[PDB]
C-alpha cells in the first residue's frame, strides 16, 4: 500500500483498491466442464477486465 | 456437336437484350462447336414454381452452364436457392452474379457455385488495410447475430491474431433491434472511438438513432462501416462523418452477363480431351444415375483466365469469388455522398476532397483516449497488506 | 395421417403390408394415424414435387416419414428445401437421407436419424485407450468438412493422463499415380491409420494401399465416413440393427409425440401444408423447431439439436471379419463402453506383430524396496505416471 501511494503521486493517476472474491492466487485449473482451461483467482480477474 | 448454355433472367425486357448478349458468343475464340440457343425463362413468383421450371426448359436443351442473378424485387435471394439444388444434384455448372451472400460460400452443401461478385463477407479485407494508413491501433466492432453477420467476425479474427493483439471487444446484438441501447454505454467506457458496424440495412438505422440521444455521434469518433447502410432508409438518421464502402459494378447485370458468358466459352475449349464428352442426362422425367464428367472440369472452370470485360482479371479462387476487385471508398457529408478514394487490391488515396469527420472537426481524430482512474486488486497477506 | 414415402422398386412389395402393421404399433389419445403407402419410382426431383404436392393438396397429410434404398445422399437437400417451404416435418429413417447437413436452411423442419462427424471421433478414442493403442496416425482427403475434423483431433488428446502422440498427412490424390500415393505414405510413425475418404474415391486409395505393404492384420484402419485389408472397423449407430418394421415404427412414434407437445398447451391442427402453391404466402410460421426436446421411446433418448439431428444415439461399433462379413464388436449405450472380446494379452486379438521379435516377455515378482505392485486408481482408469502396466496371470496394476 505504501509503495502504491508513491507511484500514484509520481505518475499522477487515481485509484480505488478492492479485494479479491476468492482468497486464492492464479492457477490454470484445467477442468472438463470447459473446452481446455480457464484462469481462476487473481490472475483471471486481471484478464476479465 | 452443339454446346448449349442455359440462363435465367429477371424480366421479359431482360429477355430482349439477352439475345443481343449471346449474339456475340458464337463469334469468339475458335468456336469449334459453339452453337448456342436462347434457353432462358423468367423469375417465377414462387420458389416451388422455379424448382420444377429449371429442368423442363433449361435442361430440356441440354445446357452445360446456368446464369443466375438477383430478382428485380429486393427479396431474400429467391433465384439462386432453387437452382443450386436441382442443378447441384445434377452436377451442372452455374455462374452467379448480383447475389453477394456468405451462405453460398461453404462447399458442404453448394458444391458447384462460382460467381465473380465478391460476397458481403469480403468487405472485412478493406477495413483492416484502410485503418493502416490512418494508424488506428485497436478497434471495437458490432455484429448482428446472424450467419451473414458472424462471417465477417470470423474473417477479422484470423487476420488480427498474428499481426495484432486482437480487438478490444466483439460484443454482439440480436437482429430484432428494438430499443437496443443497453449495450451502448458498455461500449462507451473503453475509450476506442473507432467503432465498426456491419449490420444489415434496417437495423443499422436503429443503431444510429440509439446513438443519437447518448451523444455517440459527436466529435472524436470515426465510423468505419460497410456498404448496405448507406442506401435505403439508413440514409436518414445517419451521422455526417460516415466512411461507407461501395462496389463499382453493383446492381448491374447487363454488362456482367456479357462478360460472364465468354468465360464459359474459353473453358469449353479445354473440355474436348481424352475423357468422354457424353451428353448430360436428357430431361428429368425419369433418371437416377448422375453423370461422371461433371466434376471432371470444375477445376478447369474455376482456373479459367479471361482478359476482357471488368478489369480483365476474372480469376476464381477455391471458393466462388474474383480477385483484386475495386471498391472505391465513399464518404458522406451533409446528406450527400462523395468520393474520397479508390481501392484496387491496395490502399490508394487521392487528394479529391478534404475528409470530413463526425462532430464537424476537420482534422483527423485519433481514436485513442486514456482513463487516469483504474481499478486495483489485492490479497490478504500479513506482513505486506494488512486487513 | 402420415405419408410413408418409400424409394426403390424392391420396397413396393412391402409397402402394402407395412401400412396397417404400424397403425396399431403406436397409439396415442386424441390422435388418428392413417399411414399412406407410395409405390413411386425414380429419383428425379419431379415425383418429389409433383405427386408429393398432390398428397399435400388432396390427402392433407401431416408428418412425412421418408425411406430410401440407395446410399447416395445427394437427394437429401431437395427435400430439405421442401421442408422449410411448406413447413412440414420430414423424418428419414435410413438410406441416402441419413447423412448430416450443417448448416440447415432457416425455418426448416427436417429431422435426421444418424451420427455426425463429432460423436464418432469421441467413441473411437475410448476403444484406442482400451486396447492400449495410444500411438496413432490420422490422415484425410479433400472433404467438405475436414477442417472441423482436424481441429477436433487435438482437442481429444489435450487431456487424459495418457500422453498421446499424433502424426499424419494432409491429402491424397488417387489420380496422381500409384507411386505418387505411396511416396508420401512412408511418413508414418505408428501402426494405426485413420482416414476420411469419399465413397467414389474409397476404392483407389484402398487398392493403392496394398502397394504400400499395409494390408495385413498387423495394421488397422478406422473408417470415419459413412482387396479389403484386415482390421477394418466402422460406426453404424444401430444401422445394421432394429430390422425394418421396428425402424419404421420409431419414426411414427416421435411424430405422434410431436403433436402432443403442442396440443397440451392448446388443441390446434395446423393447415400450412394443405396447399402448396394455392396461397402465395409463407410468412406464417412459428415454433417450427421449438418442439422435440424431451422425446423418450424404446428406452432411448430422442433429443434433437437445433440443427435437427439426434444428439443422444445408441451407437454400436461394427467390425470386419476375415470372411468379408460385418459384425458388431462393442456397444456405446449412454456414454458407456462395456465392450466385448476382452483386452487381455495385448498385441493379441485384432493386432499381430508383422515383424520385429522385439516383443520379449519378462517375468517378475514383488519385493518391497526393489519392485512395488499396487492396484491402479479407479477414478483415473489408467496407470499412474512413472509406472508401467503389470498384467497378472488379469487385472492391470501399476
UniProtKB/Swiss-Prot annotation, chain A:
NMDA is probably regulated by C-terminal phosphorylation of an isoform of GRIN1 by PKC. Its phosphorylated state is influenced by the formation of the NMDAR-PPP2CB complex and the NMDAR channel activity. Glycans are attached at residues 12, 32. This is Glutamate receptor ionotropic, NMDA 1. A hydrophobic region that gives rise to the prediction of a transmembrane span does not cross the membrane, but is part of a discontinuously helical region that dips into the membrane and is probably part of the pore and of the selectivity filter. The gene is GRIN1. It is linked to Neurodevelopmental disorder with or without hyperkinetic movements and seizures, autosomal dominant: An autosomal dominant neurodevelopmental disorder characterized by severe intellectual disability and developmental delay, absent speech, muscular hypotonia, dyskinesia, and hyperkinetic movements. Cortical blindness, cerebral atrophy, and seizures are present in some patients. It is found in: Cell membrane; Postsynaptic cell membrane; Postsynaptic density membrane; Synaptic cell membrane. Belongs to the glutamate-gated ion channel (TC 1.A.10.1) family. NR1/GRIN1 subfamily. Component of N-methyl-D-aspartate (NMDA) receptors (NMDARs) that function as heterotetrameric, ligand-gated cation channels with high calcium permeability and voltage-dependent block by Mg(2+). NMDARs participate in synaptic plasticity for learning and memory formation by contributing to the long-term potentiation (LTP). Channel activation requires binding of the neurotransmitter L-glutamate to the GluN2 subunit, glycine or D-serine binding to the GluN1 subunit, plus membrane depolarization to eliminate channel inhibition by Mg(2+). The chain holds residues 460 to 508 of 938 of the full protein.
From Swiss-Prot, chain B:
Disulfide bonds join 55-284. Its main location: membrane. One of its GO terms (biological process) is response to glycine. Keywords: Calcium, Cell membrane, Disease variant, Disulfide bond, Epilepsy, Glycoprotein, Intellectual disability, Ion channel, Ion transport, Ligand-gated ion channel, Magnesium, Membrane, Metal-binding, Phosphoprotein, Postsynaptic cell membrane, Receptor, Signal, Synapse, Transmembrane, Transmembrane helix, Transport, Zinc. NMDA is probably regulated by C-terminal phosphorylation of an isoform of GRIN1 by PKC. Its phosphorylated state is influenced by the formation of the NMDAR-PPP2CB complex and the NMDAR channel activity. Residues 1-387 are extracellular. One of its GO terms (cellular component) is postsynaptic density membrane. GO terms for molecular function: amyloid-beta binding; calcium ion binding; calmodulin binding; glutamate binding; glutamate-gated calcium ion channel activity; glycine binding; glycine-gated cation channel activity; ligand-gated sodium channel activity. It is found in: Cell membrane; Postsynaptic cell membrane; Postsynaptic density membrane; Synaptic cell membrane. The keyword Glycoprotein applies. Coiled coil: none annotated. The keyword Cell inner membrane does not apply. Glycans are attached at residues 37, 179, 215, 252, 276, 326, 344. Component of N-methyl-D-aspartate (NMDA) receptors (NMDARs) that function as heterotetrameric, ligand-gated cation channels with high calcium permeability and voltage-dependent block by Mg(2+). NMDARs participate in synaptic plasticity for learning and memory formation by contributing to the long-term potentiation (LTP). Channel activation requires binding of the neurotransmitter L-glutamate to the GluN2 subunit, glycine or D-serine binding to the GluN1 subunit, plus membrane depolarization to eliminate channel inhibition by Mg(2+). Belongs to the glutamate-gated ion channel (TC 1.A.10.1) family. NR1/GRIN1 subfamily. This is Glutamate receptor ionotropic, NMDA 1. The lineage of its organism: Eukaryota, Metazoa, Chordata, Craniata, Vertebrata. The gene is GRIN1.
From Swiss-Prot, chain C:
Residues 1-398 are extracellular. Changing residue 89 to S: In a breast cancer sample; somatic mutation. It is found in: Cell membrane; Postsynaptic cell membrane. Disulfide bonds join 53-276, 383-398. It comes from the Eukaryota. Glycans are attached at residues 41, 280, 294, 312. A hydrophobic region that gives rise to the prediction of a transmembrane span does not cross the membrane, but is part of a discontinuously helical region that dips into the membrane and is probably part of the pore and of the selectivity filter. Component of N-methyl-D-aspartate (NMDA) receptors (NMDARs) that function as heterotetrameric, ligand-gated cation channels with high calcium permeability and voltage-dependent block by Mg(2+). Participates in synaptic plasticity for learning and memory formation. Channel activation requires binding of the neurotransmitter L-glutamate to the GluN2 subunit, glycine or D-serine binding to the GluN1 subunit, plus membrane depolarization to eliminate channel inhibition by Mg(2+). NMDARs mediate simultaneously the potasium efflux and the influx of calcium and sodium. Belongs to the glutamate-gated ion channel (TC 1.A.10.1) family. NR2D/GRIN2D subfamily. Heterotetramer. Forms heterotetrameric channels composed of two GluN1/zeta subunits (GRIN1), and two identical GluN2/epsilon subunits (GRIN2A, GRIN2B, GRIN2C or GRIN2D) or GluN3 subunits (GRIN3A or GRIN3B) (in vitro). In vivo, the subunit composition may depend on the expression levels of the different subunits. Interacts with PDZ domains of PATJ and DLG4. This is Glutamate receptor ionotropic, NMDA 2D.
